[model samples]
Target: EDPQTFEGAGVVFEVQVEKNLVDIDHRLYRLPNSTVRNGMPSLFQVKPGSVVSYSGTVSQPWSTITDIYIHKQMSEQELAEMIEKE
Candidate 1:
């Protein structure tokens, strides 16, 4: 199915930095224990501009994320490469 239009929390999609900024992403990325799940190999912290993808699901909204994967960290090089593609 089309991830953008999948319309559920489980849908996974790549999120890149835009204008050196990014929304907090979603609440599901944050667990109840305060440990941040960035969908990376390990669980850690995250900052704005960090590339990531949401994993999980619900009904018809992407606002609520169940898991997050860190596709790339926040860095000028990474941002630049992604920006160019945009």
Candidate 2:
């Protein structure tokens, strides 16, 4: 389970990042929302980011989402430049 495989596999469940002010290692973790349900393992057996229809309760009390993004494409240099310009 690595960030590089997130796009290929269904998910990696975690992403590693450099240390920051928040902690020695500002690691980011992710899990599909479907995991909230008991039958979620079957739901995530498909492609990444696939939407599934469920008829039962699907929520977690401690579940938290930090951020999410949708994008066309952007290189690190381009992303840095965009942030600097902003």
Candidate 3:
């Protein structure tokens, strides 16, 4: 599947970030949770329940994340609904 189309379909938070890995769709990769004298915020630190759109490469283990977007605007009700829709 094309990245463009795949993202276009559903870029929701169904696949949440787990531990150091941001798992989106059928793909996942470890997000670098590193230090900050030379710090970056959104690019580095992400929480467990955050939404993202980047991960591992095809047939490969360690790969670079191309693009990333963190979602945090969902209301309390919406968050519950997101989980409840099974």
RMSD of each: 10.2, 14.7, 8.8
**Regions more than 4 Å wrong, model 3:** 1-20, 25-27, 30-43, 55-59, 75-86
lDDT of each: 0.38, 0.30, 0.44
Better of 1 and 2 by lDDT: 1
C-alpha lDDT of residue 22 in model 1: 21
Residues 20-85, candidate 2: write the lDDT tens digits: 111111222333443333444332332333322222221243122222232323335677788999
lDDT of 1 by residue, 1-86 (tens): 64532222232222323321124434333222222444342233334455555543343322334455555434367668889999
TM-score of candidate 2 versus the correct structure, residues matched by position: 0.18
Report how far off residue 15 is in candidate 2 (Å).
12
Compare candidates 2 and 3 on TM-score and give the better one: 3
Best by lDDT: 3
The predicted structure with the larger TM-score, 1 or 3, is: 3
